[PDB]
Structure formats: C-alpha cells, structure tokens
Design a binder for this molecule. Structure first.
Ligand SMILES: NC(=O)c1ccc[n+]([C@@H]2O[C@H](COP(=O)([O-])OP(=O)(O)OC[C@H]3O[C@@H](n4cnc5c(N)ncnc54)[C@H](OP(=O)(O)O)[C@@H]3O)[C@@H](O)[C@H]2O)c1
Ligand SMILES: NC(=O)c1ccc[n+]([C@@H]2O[C@H](COP(=O)([O-])OP(=O)(O)OC[C@H]3O[C@@H](n4cnc5c(N)ncnc54)[C@H](OP(=O)(O)O)[C@@H]3O)[C@@H](O)[C@H]2O)c1
Ligand SMILES: [K+]
Ligand SMILES: [K+]
Ligand code: NA
Ligand code: NA
Lengths: 313, 313
C-alpha cells in the first residue's frame, strides 16, 4: 500500500494515473493540485511547484526525464523544496538510449557520406562525385560518457569509426579511448572530427562549448549537441561556422527554448535544428522503470539512477 | 605464370597494374591498348571495347563493378565479343556492402526521425515538435535480396524495423519475410513504407518502379533507388511525389547519367540526389577479391560471384 502523487505540466495526466495504477495495483495514484497537502509516499514530477514537495518526507521523487538540471536549480533557489532525506531519481535510458543512437548514427553517416555537400551541389543542379572520407580521419568524440554517451559510442563502434569519450572518471570501454577531467580535455578535442555532446547541465559544464574549445577541434569538424543548450555559446559557434572551422552543426537544444526567431541559427546554411526531440520520454517505458525501481527500493536491492545532489547530476 | 590485361576508362591504370603485380607476383600485367592482340589469361575490364575481348579464349573476365548490365548489353549487340567458354565474374561486395548499409541506414533513420519535416519547418524559423513515427508503421521492403540487399536488410534489422525482401527465389533470413516472383510483388509492396531498390538491370526489371508499382505502396512512402536508373520511370515517380503518395525519394542512379539539368528531379522539393556514389569500387579490396578468386579457380575450389549470361545477372 502506497500513495503516489503525479505532476507534469503538459503530459496526459489521466493516462499516467491509469497506467501507474495498473503497473502498481496496490498504489493509490492522484494528480497533484495546489492545496493538496495529503500524505504521499512517492512523487513523479516534471517542473514541480515548490509547494508540491516542500516539507514532505517522501520515500523517493522520480523526475520524468533524463536531465534534472531544472529541479536541481530550483532546489538551489528554494532549499526548503526537497528535504535532504528524500532520494531523487531520474529516468535512466527507458528508450532514450536507442533514440540517441538513431539520431547520432543517422547524422554522423550523413556527414561522413557528404550528403550535405551533395545537397549544396543539388541546389545548383550540379552533378559532381566527391572524394570519399576515410574513417581514420573521422574520429568521433563523445562529451559525456554516461548512460546515453555509452549507448551512442556502442552504436558508432559498430560502424568502425575511431572513438573517444570524455568524463570525470576513467572508462573501460574496449576500443574507446577514455579522457578524464579538464586537464585532459584539450588532448581529447585535438582529434574530434565529430563532437557529440551528451553532458548534463551542471555549473561545471555551462558554456563549455565555446571559442576556446572549438578552436582546438580539427578543421572541418562537426558538432552534434544532444544535451543542453547552455553547453554551447551560440555566438562562438556561429563564428566557428562562418570561419570554416566547423563544417556543420546539428542542434536539438538551445539556451532559450523555443529558439527565438531572431536567432541567426535558424537560417544559417550549415546549421540543422530540431526542437528538443532527440530522445523523448516514452510514458510506457517510464512507468515500467519507475514501478520496477520502487519494487527494488522496497526489497532493499541496490538501485541505479539516483541523483547525487552534491555532485549536480 | 599468367598474363593479365587491364582496361578501365577512367581509373588510375598504372596504380592498378602495380597493385596487381604485388598481389599476384607471378603475373605479367599490362594495360590494354587498341591493337594489342598478344595472349592473355585473364582480363579485368570496365566498359571494354569489343576488340579487347573478341576472339580471346580467356580463362576468366572480371568486371570491375557489381553491376554487369553494360557488358551484357554490349555482348547482346556484339555476340562475338565474349566466347561462351569464358566465365564472367563481377565484384561481390568488396566493401560495397558496408557502403550500401551506410547509405540506407542513414537515410532510413533520417526519414524515420522526420528530419525532412524539421528541415522544412526550419526554413520558416518555425519551432514545432512532431509526433514520432512507430516501427510498426515503418516496414522496409528491399527490392532484390542479393549480396547488397542482404547486407542492407541485416543492418536495418539491427534497428528493429520490420523487414521484407523480394527476389526470384525464396530466402531464409529469420525475421525477414521473403516474397518471390511477380506473382507476389503486389503483396510485397502493400506494406512497404520504405522501398529500397537493389535489383540488377535486366530486361525483366527495366521500368519496374512505375505508376502501377507506386500506387500499391502505402501513403507517405519513401523510395531509395540505389540500383540502376532504368528501374525507375522518372515521370511516374514525379507524379507520385506531386500527389503525396511518395513523401520522399533519394536517388543515386538515373536513366541518363550525369542527370541532365532539365530534369525536374534536381529542384523537386522531396527529392535528394547523389551522383552515383552509393557504393564505389575500392581498388585495394577489388585487387584482393580478384587475386583470391584467381587462386580459387586454379585450385578447383567452387567460386562465387560468377555471372549467369542466360539469366542476365
Ligand atoms: N531530447 C534531448 O535532447 C535529451 C534527452 C535526454 C537527455 N538529454 C541530456 O543528456 C544528458 C546525459 O544523460 P545521461 O543519462 O547520459 O546522464 P549520465 O548517465 O549522468 O551521464 C553524464 C556524463 O557526463 C559526465 N560529466 C558530468 N559532469 C562532468 C564534468 N564536469 N566533466 C566531465 N564530464 C562530466 C559524467 O562523467 P562520469 O561518468 O565520470 O560521472 C557522465 O559520464 C542529460 O543530462 C540531459 O541533459 C537530452
Ligand atoms: N553505386 C551504386 O549505386 C551501386 C553499386 C553497386 C551495385 N549497384 C547495383 O546493385 C545491384 C545489386 O548488386 P548485388 O551484388 O546485390 O547483385 P546480386 O547479388 O546478383 O543480387 C540481385 C538480386 O536481384 C534479384 N532479382 C534479379 N532479377 C529479378 C527479377 N526479375 N525478379 C525478382 N528479383 C530479381 C535476385 O534474386 P535471386 O536472389 O532470386 O537471384 C537477387 O536477389 C547491382 O546489379 C548494381 O546495379 C549499385
Ligand atoms: K542564437
Ligand atoms: K528526369
Ligand atoms: Na481519477
Ligand atoms: Na608499366
């Protein structure tokens, strides 16, 4: 027997309640409204109001996404929102791994096969085979080597691209050179023909993709930002695009979302924009992960997917 | 000890001669010029002149490509060109399998993730997440289930797309529904959200992708022509593009190559054009396949990659 409160600003609240009741039949599930101060054991939230969590000794909070920077930043401004005793969980993969693989593999191959060059030539009705690129010149670097970074690396390794990753701690993936810490970031960047960003938004990573980082990439590099918009200094990226340093950039996330129409990114020739749809939360897989995690918590089984509030992700 | 004559209209003749001499050190290799009637054991050819092969009792001819429709059509017009005793071989895979996989996986995922829709929206600086497509609605059909068709099917199966193939004879690939013969072509087409053409050019397949075939596809279908241009009736494809039957078409081959500038395909919004570069012949891999095949022929080992002239491919 448990009480679950649910909040999401836009999802189909009623669908989630019913799906949760089926997956956890002993649970009483309700949508949280302002003024609801009744007891609750678990909270499933996205962009929760401070009032929903403040003062509650919850058994756990589940953030309905892979990123938790919005909740953590709100907790920094409102420390009363989440008691330190409450463990905070996020969605680990739950289908977002495959979605990132689809996105990254498609576009890496797109660039590797020079479909962007052939499109420019097609615009002028110009027929001209181009020299093929070689894998030895197409090392792919993944900023962030976590749940999603590892999935993307694995899918690209299938295609025999040289691979490297960057994180805080060393990784052991065969065939993927692991770089760790700011002290190794420059060496990491020196060979990244394609740079894929899958970092979390933390104070230590804000603005990391800036002029100083971009200039260390090889010439004709490609940028794939699948993480958070604050990671990229957009005016620095535009300068690197205009100078020829970056041959192409595909961006799914931006400092302001929706991306304002005045942004030069919309109409820049070498920029491809998707409206933050790289890896969406699939309700059925999220319900399965949450219900399974709750069962593991009840059985005392060690669990994965817990946020370290001191660490920031 | 053997004599090899080499002809290619555009490749680096001298590089090929030297590479062949290294791979087959007992071989005397020479570029064929008009008037060269000296003896030869093997001929490596692409678009060979009739004079090069006529009257020669060669041990084998190796066509320097996967398709042999140009040689077979020339032999039909000049039956004296190749004695019936001469076995004819083509390049089987030799790296073209992976190239077709790169091409097909990239573009299938491109369409599956609606990057074409997001690009149209980006042209207007319009931010709008779109509903995701589902694999159950994205059955991929492969016209031609051969060396390259099987490789493409295998790579797409990795991504959990429903798969079917069409050929003359039944296939046994687990998870891929095999359709065989014209009598099953209509049933094959009925579910193909994406149609990938990897057929050979033969009299039995010319013009197969026409109005009658396209109308049997599901609405919003996609066409990927990686095979030969004569397979597609281009005015029928344009009509299906203008009516909304076909959502997108990516074409690497055309009835006339280079594609004349007057073709409406160049500037049609839903058409993507590459200049016959889907899977190019890589000299080093071709030299390895040819030298290995010759050794197998000398040892009496059963060989693959032989053209059936009565069959047409
Ligand atoms: N639609 C979308 O665009 C979409 C969807 C889902 C997620 N995302 C984004 O993708 C991000 C990654 O998700 P995930 O599940 O892969 O997260 P994760 O498993 O926590 O992985 C985070 C990785 O970043 C590394 N990292 C963090 N801070 C660092 C620093 N200061 N220096 C170097 N490396 C650092 C971590 O290194 P260690 O391994 O050493 O800890 C870890 O490898 C999310 O935070 C979210 O913002 C975007
Ligand atoms: N850059 C490029 O665009 C590029 C590069 C390389 C090749 N290609 C093209 O790709 C083609 C395929 O090469 P491949 O090595 O895969 O050839 P393959 O191994 O001979 O495969 C041909 C397939 O087509 C099927 N087929 C032939 N005639 C048919 C008919 N009348 N009805 C139904 N099915 C039929 C065959 O069926 P069975 O299996 O029953 O015999 C076979 O499965 C080449 O011929 C070439 O034109 C293009
Ligand atoms: K901007
Ligand atoms: K045309
Ligand atoms: Na209710
Ligand atoms: Na010479």
């Amino acid at each position: 027997h448990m009480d679950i409160i649910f909040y999401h600003p836009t999802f189909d609240t009623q669908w989630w309640i019913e799906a949760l009741r089926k997956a956890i039949p002993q649970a009483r599930v309700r949508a949280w409204k302002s003024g609801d101060n009744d007891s609750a054991d678990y909270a499933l939230v996205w962009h929760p109001p401070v009032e929903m969590l403040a003062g509650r000794d919850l058994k756990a909070v589940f953030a309905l996404g892979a990123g938790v920077d919005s909740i953590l930043s709100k907790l920094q401004a409102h420390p009363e929102m989440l008691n330190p005793s409450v463990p905070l969980f996020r969605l680990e993969d739950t289908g977002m791994g495959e979605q990132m693989q689809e996105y990254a593999v498609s576009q890496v191959l797109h660039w590797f096969r020079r479909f962007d060059d052939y499109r420019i030539q097609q615009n002028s009705s110009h027929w001209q085979p181009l020299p093929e690129y070689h894998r030895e010149d197409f090392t792919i670097g993944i900023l962030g080597a976590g749940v999603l970074g590892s999935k993307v690396a694995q899918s690209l390794q299938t295609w025999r691209f040289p691979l490297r990753c960057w994180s805080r701690t060393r990784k052991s993936w065969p065939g993927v050179q692991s770089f760790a810490g700011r002290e190794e970031l420059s060496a990491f960047l020196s060979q990244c023909r394609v740079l894929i960003n899958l970092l979390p938004n933390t104070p230590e990573t804000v603005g990391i993709i800036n002029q100083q980082l971009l200039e260390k990439l090889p010439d004709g590099a490609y940028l794939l930002n699948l993480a958070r918009g604050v990671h990229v200094v957009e005016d620095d990226l535009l300068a690197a695009l205009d100078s020829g340093k970056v041959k192409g950039a595909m961006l799914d996330v931006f400092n302001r979302e929706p991306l304002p129409p005045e942004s030069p990114l919309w109409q820049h020739p070498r920029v491809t924009i998707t409206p933050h749809v790289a890896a969406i939360t699939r309700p059925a897989e999220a319900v399965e992960y949450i219900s399974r995690t709750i069962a593991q918590l009840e059985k005392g089984e060690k669990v994965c997917g817990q946020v370290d509030r001191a660490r920031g992700y």
